Short mmCIF file of C-alpha atoms and ligand atoms in Angstrom, two decimals:
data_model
loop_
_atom_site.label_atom_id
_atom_site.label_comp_id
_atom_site.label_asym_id
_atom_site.label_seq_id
_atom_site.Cartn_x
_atom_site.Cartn_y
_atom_site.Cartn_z
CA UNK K 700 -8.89 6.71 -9.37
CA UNK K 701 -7.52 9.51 -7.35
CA UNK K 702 -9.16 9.17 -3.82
CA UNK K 703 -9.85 12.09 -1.53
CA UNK K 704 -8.42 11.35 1.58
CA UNK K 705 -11.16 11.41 4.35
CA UNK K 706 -13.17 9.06 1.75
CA UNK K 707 -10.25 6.87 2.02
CA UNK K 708 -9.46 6.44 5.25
CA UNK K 709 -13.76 5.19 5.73
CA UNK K 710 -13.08 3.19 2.78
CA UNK K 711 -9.90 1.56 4.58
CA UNK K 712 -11.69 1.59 7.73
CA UNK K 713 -14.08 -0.63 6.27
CA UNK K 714 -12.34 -2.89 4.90
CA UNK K 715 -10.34 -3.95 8.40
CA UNK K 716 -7.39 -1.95 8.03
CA UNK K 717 -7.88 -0.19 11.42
CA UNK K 718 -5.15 -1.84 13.80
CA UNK K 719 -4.30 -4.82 11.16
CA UNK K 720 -1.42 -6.72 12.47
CA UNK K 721 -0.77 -3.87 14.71
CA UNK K 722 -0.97 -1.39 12.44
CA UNK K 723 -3.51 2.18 12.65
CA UNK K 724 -5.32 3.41 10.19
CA UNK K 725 -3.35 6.60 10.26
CA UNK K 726 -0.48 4.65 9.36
CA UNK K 727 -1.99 2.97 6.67
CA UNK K 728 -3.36 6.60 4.85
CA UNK K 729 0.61 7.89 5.59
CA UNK K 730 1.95 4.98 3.46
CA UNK K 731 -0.53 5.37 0.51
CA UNK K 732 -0.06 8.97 0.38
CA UNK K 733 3.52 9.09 0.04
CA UNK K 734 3.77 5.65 -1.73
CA UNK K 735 1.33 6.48 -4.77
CA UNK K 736 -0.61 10.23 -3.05
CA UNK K 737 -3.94 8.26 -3.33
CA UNK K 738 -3.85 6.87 -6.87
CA UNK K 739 -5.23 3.85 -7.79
CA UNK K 740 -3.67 3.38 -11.17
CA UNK K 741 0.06 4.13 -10.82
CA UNK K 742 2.57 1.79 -11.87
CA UNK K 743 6.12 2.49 -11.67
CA UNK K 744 8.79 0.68 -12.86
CA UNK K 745 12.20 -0.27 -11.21
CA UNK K 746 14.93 -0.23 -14.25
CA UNK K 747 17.35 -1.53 -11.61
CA UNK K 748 15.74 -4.71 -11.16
CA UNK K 749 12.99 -5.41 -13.51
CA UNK K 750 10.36 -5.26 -11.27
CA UNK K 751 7.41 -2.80 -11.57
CA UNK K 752 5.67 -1.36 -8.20
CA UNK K 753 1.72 -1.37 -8.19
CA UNK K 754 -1.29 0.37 -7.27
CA UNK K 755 -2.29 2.69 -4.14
CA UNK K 756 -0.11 0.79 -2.36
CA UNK K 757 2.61 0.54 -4.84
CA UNK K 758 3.09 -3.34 -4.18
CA UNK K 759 5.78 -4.91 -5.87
CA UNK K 760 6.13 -7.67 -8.55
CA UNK K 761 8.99 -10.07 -7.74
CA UNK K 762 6.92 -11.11 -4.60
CA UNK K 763 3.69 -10.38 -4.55
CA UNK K 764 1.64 -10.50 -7.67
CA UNK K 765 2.39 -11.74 -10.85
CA UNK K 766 2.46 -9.33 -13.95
CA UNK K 767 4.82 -12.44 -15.96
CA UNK K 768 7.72 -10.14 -16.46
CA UNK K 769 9.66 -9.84 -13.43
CA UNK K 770 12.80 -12.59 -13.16
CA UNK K 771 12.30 -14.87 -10.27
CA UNK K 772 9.31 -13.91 -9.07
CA UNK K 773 6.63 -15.34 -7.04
CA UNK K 774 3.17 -14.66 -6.49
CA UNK K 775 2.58 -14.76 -2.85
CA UNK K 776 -1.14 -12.53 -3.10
CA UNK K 777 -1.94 -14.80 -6.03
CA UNK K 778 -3.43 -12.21 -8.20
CA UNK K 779 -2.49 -10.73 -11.65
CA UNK K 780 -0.52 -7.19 -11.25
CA UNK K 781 -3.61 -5.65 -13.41
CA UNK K 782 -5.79 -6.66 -9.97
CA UNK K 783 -3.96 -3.60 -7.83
CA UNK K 784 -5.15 -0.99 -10.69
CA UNK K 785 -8.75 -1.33 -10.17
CA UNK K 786 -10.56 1.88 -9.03
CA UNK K 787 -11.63 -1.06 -6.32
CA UNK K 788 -9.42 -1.20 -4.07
CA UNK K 789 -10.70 -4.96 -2.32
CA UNK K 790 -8.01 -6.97 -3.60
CA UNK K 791 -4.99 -4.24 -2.81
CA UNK K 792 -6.18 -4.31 0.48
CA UNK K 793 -5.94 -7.99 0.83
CA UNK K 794 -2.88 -7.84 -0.81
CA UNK K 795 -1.35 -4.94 1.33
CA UNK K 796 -2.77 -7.58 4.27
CA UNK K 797 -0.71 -10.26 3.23
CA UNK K 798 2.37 -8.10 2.83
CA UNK K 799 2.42 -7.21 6.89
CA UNK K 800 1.74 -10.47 8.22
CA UNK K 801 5.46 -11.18 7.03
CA UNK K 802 8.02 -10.28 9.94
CA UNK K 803 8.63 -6.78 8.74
CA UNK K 804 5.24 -5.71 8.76
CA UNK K 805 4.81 -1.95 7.52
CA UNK K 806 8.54 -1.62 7.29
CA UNK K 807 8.60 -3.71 4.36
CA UNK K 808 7.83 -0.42 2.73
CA UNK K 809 11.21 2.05 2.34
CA UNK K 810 8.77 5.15 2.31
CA UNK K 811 6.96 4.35 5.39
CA UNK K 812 10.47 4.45 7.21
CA UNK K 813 11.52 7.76 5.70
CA UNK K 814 7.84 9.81 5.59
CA UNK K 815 5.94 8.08 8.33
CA UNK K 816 7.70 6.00 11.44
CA UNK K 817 8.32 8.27 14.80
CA UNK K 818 5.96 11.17 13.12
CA UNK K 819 3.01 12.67 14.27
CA UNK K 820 0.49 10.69 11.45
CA UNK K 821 -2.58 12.34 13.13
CA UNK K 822 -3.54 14.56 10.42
CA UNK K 823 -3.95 11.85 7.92
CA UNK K 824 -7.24 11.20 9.38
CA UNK K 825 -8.49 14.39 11.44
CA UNK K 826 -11.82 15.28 10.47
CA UNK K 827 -12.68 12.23 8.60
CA UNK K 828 -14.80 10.42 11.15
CA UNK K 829 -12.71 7.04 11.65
NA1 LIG B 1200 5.35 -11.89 -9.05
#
């Protein structure tokens, strides 16, 4: 699914992402947009290291769900990779949860860094009610 971005950013507000470990919603629709521009079922794969990125959020495989392919990897959302394709996105929010209350928080994402920390995120969610 290919989400619109107002009706994401009620979706994530409903879900608790507002302010999550720190962390504004604005934030939030900045990484998703430049990490997978709003699409549920993209899944990229990383020929460098074997490990394959997934979802909205683009979460990767060697730590945080399994897809059994990926050397050395753990499972620390416990959920199969094919869980972050759903047109739902429940569990890739709970994942994307889990990922920030690790010591890096949003920075554990390289795009967020490049795209998104020190700008003005505002107009990710002007006019969307949130
Ligand atoms: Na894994």
């Amino acid at each position: 699914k290919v989400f619109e971005r107002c009706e994401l950013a009620r979706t994530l507000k409903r879900l608790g992402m507002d302010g999550y470990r720190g962390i504004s919603l604005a934030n939030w629709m900045c990484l998703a947009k430049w990490e997978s521009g709003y699409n549920t079922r993209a899944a990229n794969y990383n020929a460098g290291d074997r490990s394959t990125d997934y979802g909205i959020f683009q979460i990767n495989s060697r730590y945080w769900c399994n897809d059994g392919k990926t050397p050395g990897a753990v499972n620390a959302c416990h959920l199969s990779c094919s869980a972050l394709l759903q047109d739902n996105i429940a569990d890739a929010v709970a994942c994307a949860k889990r990922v920030v209350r690790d010591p890096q928080g949003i920075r554990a994402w390289v795009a967020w860094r490049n795209r998104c920390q020190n700008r003005d995120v505002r107009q990710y969610v002007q006019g969307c009610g949130v």
